[PDB]
C-alpha cells in the first residue's frame, strides 16, 4: 500500500529526502529552510 512515499519529489530545491513511515521525511540542506526548503536563506 505504502511503497514509495518520496517518488514524487516532496522536498524542493534538492532538499534531503528519506522515506520512512508513510509520511516520509524531508530535511533541508544547510542553506534552504521550510516545509519543502522552499525558502532560501539568500
Amino acid at each position: 500500500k505504502d511503497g514509495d512515499q518520496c517518488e514524487g519529489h516532496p522536498c524542493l530545491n534538492q532538499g534531503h529526502c528519506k522515506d520512512g513511515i508513510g509520511d516520509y521525511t524531508c530535511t533541508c540542506a544547510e542553506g534552504f529552510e521550510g516545509k519543502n526548503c522552499e525558502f532560501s536563506t539568500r
Side-chain angles (χ1 to χ4, degrees), residues 1-2 4 8-9 12-14 18-19 24-25 27 29-38 42:
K1 297 283 185 299
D2 298 293
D4 296 287
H9 299 286
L12 290 176
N13 317 280
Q14 51 179 22
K18 285 286 180 181
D19 63 283
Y24 61 94
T25 55
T27 19
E30 179 62 76
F32 296 95
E33 32 171 55
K35 187 73 180 179
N36 306 350
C37 320
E38 186 178 272
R42 180 172 69 169

